[PDB]
Amino acid sequence: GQKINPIGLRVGIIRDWEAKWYAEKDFASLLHEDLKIRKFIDNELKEASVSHVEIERAANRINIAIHTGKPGMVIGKGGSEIEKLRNKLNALTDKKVHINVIEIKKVDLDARLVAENIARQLENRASFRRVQKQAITRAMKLGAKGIKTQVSGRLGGADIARAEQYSEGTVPLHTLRADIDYAHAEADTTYGKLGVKVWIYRGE
Amino acid sequence: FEIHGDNLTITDAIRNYIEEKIGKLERYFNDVPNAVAHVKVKTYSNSATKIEVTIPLKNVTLRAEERNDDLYAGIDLINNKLERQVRKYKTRINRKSR
Amino acid sequence: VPKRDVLPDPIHNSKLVTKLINKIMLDGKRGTAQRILYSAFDLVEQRSGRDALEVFEEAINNIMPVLEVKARSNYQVPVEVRPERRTTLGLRWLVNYARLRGEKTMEDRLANEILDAANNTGGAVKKREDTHKMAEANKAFAH
RNA sequence: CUUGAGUGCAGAAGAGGAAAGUGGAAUUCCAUGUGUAGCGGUGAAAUGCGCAGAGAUAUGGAGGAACACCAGUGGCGAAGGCGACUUUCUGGUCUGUAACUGACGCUGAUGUGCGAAAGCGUGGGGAUCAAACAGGAUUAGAUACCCUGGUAGUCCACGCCGUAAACGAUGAGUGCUAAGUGUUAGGGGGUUUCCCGCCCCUUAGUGCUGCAGCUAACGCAUUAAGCACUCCGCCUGGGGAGUACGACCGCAAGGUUGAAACUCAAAGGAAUUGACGGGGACCCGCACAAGCGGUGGAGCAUGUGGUUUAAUUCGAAGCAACGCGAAGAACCUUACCAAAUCUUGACAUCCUUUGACAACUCUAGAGAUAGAGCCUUCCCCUUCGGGGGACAAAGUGACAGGUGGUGCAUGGUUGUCGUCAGCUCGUGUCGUGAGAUGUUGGGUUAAGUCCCGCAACGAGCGCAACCCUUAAGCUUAGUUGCCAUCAUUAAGUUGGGCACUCUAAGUUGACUGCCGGUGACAAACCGGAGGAAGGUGGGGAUGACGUCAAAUCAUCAUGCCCCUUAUGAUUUGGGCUACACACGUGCUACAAUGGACAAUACAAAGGGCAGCGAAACCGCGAGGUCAAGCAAAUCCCAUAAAGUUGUUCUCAGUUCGGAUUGUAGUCUGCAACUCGACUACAUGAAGCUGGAAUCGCUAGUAAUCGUAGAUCAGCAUGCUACGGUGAAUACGU
Secondary structure (H helix, E strand, C coil): CCCCCHHHHHCCCCCCCCCCCCCCCCHHHHHHHHHHHHHHHHHHHHHHCCCCECCECCCCCCEECECCCCHHHHHCCCCCCHHHHHHHHHHHHCCCCEECCCCCCCCCCCHHHHHHHHHHHHHCCCCHHHHHHHHHHHHHHHCCCEEEEEEEECCCCCCCCEEEECCECCCCCCCCCCCCCCCCECCCCCCCCCCEEEEEECCC | CCCEEECCCCCHHHHHHHHHHHHHHHHCCCCCCCCEEEEECCCCCCCCCEEEEEEEECCEEEEEEEECCCHHHHHHHHCCCCCCCCCCCCCCCCCCCC | CCCCCCCCCCCCCCCHHHHHHHHHCCCCCCHHHHHHHHHHHHHHHHCCCCCHHHHHHHHCCCCCCCEEEECCCCCCEEEECCHHHHHHHHHHHHHHHHHHHCCCCCCHHHHHHHHHHHCCCHHHHHHHHHHHHHCCCCCCCCC
């Protein structure tokens, strides 16, 4: 207890690793190599709003494939950006890359996308709850079996910490076959820090 | 009791006052295994004078607290609580037949 | 809830030796307990030499009670014993008095105790007595 | 005039009253007899009584009280109150009749009389009981509860007082307004061969349940708190206060009548939700119990407090701080202190000036660092320049940075009750309303587990389940693993075989599933068969809504405030560990179940790249030399201890004991003094099982003996993981 995102409890069974390469004891080099990429993507977060990326590392190459809802953005018209991204990356990775975007389907159903979404409408001076109303509204729309959506901090730019969540759709959480995509976000304007903890259930 | 003071330096004046008071409970019964005192300045910023006290008893114990303007008012107000929180207990009174 | 039986004694084909080595078996060390007990079956079967069961069975029918007591306001009731508890407590004061001779040997204190106890003497025949002086003294107000 | 009221006529019942008069039991006492040693009372005792003969037993006597069963949600009374019986006097009530009067009635200020218990007076009597009171006991204390006794009084008459929760918390009378069911005094009709049996109707009273109606709601509802009428009395926020002054009554006690000053913004009633109970009904739990083993007693360690200090850094503490943060304080770490120090700074980006970015020494310095010598020296592109990865020192102002503060400005993260069995909602109903329903009643499970019944129905989170490990088998595959047939080596060493064990992935398997019984047949539960495993096999993970303004600004981030030649940053040393002491936690001794010594058998897990360092060699050993092998089913680490076999010691403060201090050494580190561990020699402290009090544990458990791993230059009485050995108890709640 008290609670943990089930992903830690679900992984090793029902999902891939979030980053991958061959299994040798040079991990301090290679893990902290991966992280140098994981940082840089935040520049694209402001431009891409991707969910995540899992890297493979072929025997002398690297493969990453970015889970975005903004393909033509990141592809550009004819790849005017991806290639200087190869070289500005390869400049820092000290080793090459073969990026290949893996566009998001279904499409804007995901947790992370919606997570920073509502965080940003909130950051633009919004009564918080209605954002979650339209969120869940388009959520059951797109076809989903279980949701809730939580928020913390100094809501409405006012006095001491609070919380709220709107639960709808039956959400199997204490199960072990749920295959659900937990998320998190962080964004304030002037008063503290107001993250969120969205939940979903789609398939098993 | 670890008569510790958060953001207030326990003088001998304060120790004398405290222990002096609990001496009065030798009415019942002392029997002194231990006793503690938590005191703190928690800014509101009207800002306190918090008192939380703990009494371990025979086969049981009784915690006691309270807030007030200053330390001496907090020790006097928290008094007359950890007495009635203690009194009564027993007797209890015999049977069975049959 | 059952009491986790011991099968036979593998020494003379009794049983309660096994129940008894385990009561000498301190620290989980069996071999030293088994050692000193069977040694005591050498000593007591030597002195006034005889079978194991004469001194043993007799002595543990000289101390092995029939009535005990329990409390319940507080009124101590005399009670009939379940024979496992009977034998249990007999052996309890057996070893738990065996140390209490205050002597040197592994076995003399034992063989002194069971020899003495076959003769209706010592603190184990005693605790049978005093126990049965709590029984039938306390028949009145709790039976 | 009679239908109101009343008298009559005939009936009926009645603890209705006042005075008087008898009767019996029962207590207390007394006399007498019997007869010995306790009685009596208590939660447990004592106070008390008892050899002068108690109490008990028995006969008799005394006298005062109250009058058992009947007795009833029964009656009578205007109200208080009225219960042995009989007598004298007397009032009152209900029924039916009605011929008489002929509206004579209802209410009723003032006024007047009745009136519980307590009490006052004149007297009398005085058994029990018991204020006051005396005493014991209890209690931290007890004037009190409790026990022992005992006065007033309780009792009679006569007088007085004139109150009460004097309550149906409901003013008197008249009349209408659904039912049904009882009990009491009557009356009338029918039936019955005779009603005694029974049925029907009616009056009066009396209770119970319930429409309408009323009601704030509780609830009343033909004995209205309904519907209307007549008369009386009473209320105007609470407190102050039914109090003061005044007046009347009273022997007095006190009563009757009855204000304000000032004060408060509330006081209050009915009901709902939640909590609480020194309440109940039920259930589970090392909570009890039954056992075993420990702390607290000695020495050591560790954290904290407390002490100290130039500094002895910050926080964390009831369970849920105190072997925690910090899973390694000689420097580093370190936050703290001294000094030597710098300021766009330790370091980061931007703009400007350049550049491949500086190695080896010398001088001083304690280093930091400077003074220099010195070699960093446009490497990709360049058409002549430039662009550029990366640079120098300087300027550049933003800035940098803050272990400066605020965990009550926060996010994030986490303990907690609790792995308890509960926790909500959509729809609908109910109800003025909050709110309830579902989630309740019966069974049942470990559980909101299921089933039944039910203005409830459905859904959610939660439990189980799903997953990991473990117990059995089948298959798949055979090396570094195994040797079954073998031959063979010191040795599974070699040949060979994967058969066996082993080895990692999919199989089958346990699901009340099969049966028998019990059971509202259902839910289920008890039993039995097999099965490796029967009742969610064992454990692991997962910890609902939520409480603790729980914890953390010092993980990280961050709202706000503050600083900025310092509240920042650099260096050498100190310190974070001092000790009269205390708290917690652990470790080691207090011994023959044993200590000293010799020989010998058995594991699991896991580390290893320049790390694991095999053998050999040196040495009293710590260690030192050498070097085979090996990124591991291999080689090495690494050898298990307890134990088994013996010898001795033979109950000493001992060969217990193992702190203390010194001496001489090994490893690491530039450096073992404040402040590393270990080896050899000596020295041998306290301490004989720990007092009151107090802690854990239900089976491979406890208890005990070992092993490895991280944290790492060095370093764990700690933590994590692994195994070896290995019991007692569990009635019942």
